[PDB]
Amino acid sequence: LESNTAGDPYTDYEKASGSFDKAIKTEARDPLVAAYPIVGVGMEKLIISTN
């Protein structure tokens, strides 16, 4: 009863078929695993330029 079961922009066929952006990890082909990016940012250095 839903175009997109997982809720992500890709419909159940799309996920099941594997016919989308192929870079997506393969488990997200399951219509219950959200094809969904989780992006955090890491610090490595800090520069203090006195004015």
Partner 1 sequence: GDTLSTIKAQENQIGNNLSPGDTYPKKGLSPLALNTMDQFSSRLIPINYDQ
**Where do contacts with partner 1 occur on this chain (CB under 8 A)?**
45, 47, 49-50
Distance CA 26, CA 35 (A): 9
Give the pair of three-digit tokens for residue 12.
Answer: 């159940």
Q: How far is the CB of 40 from partner 1 (least distance, A)?
A: 19
Residue 12 binding partner per list Ca ion, partner 1, none, with a CB distance cut-off of 5 to 8 Å that depends on partner kind: Ca ion
Distance CA 6, CA 21 (A): 16
Question: 14: annotated binding-site residue?
Answer: no
Q: At which residue do the structure tokens 């219950």 appear?
A: 32
Question: 12: annotated binding-site residue?
Answer: yes
Q: Which residue ranges make up the annotated binding site for Ca(2+)?
A: 2, 12
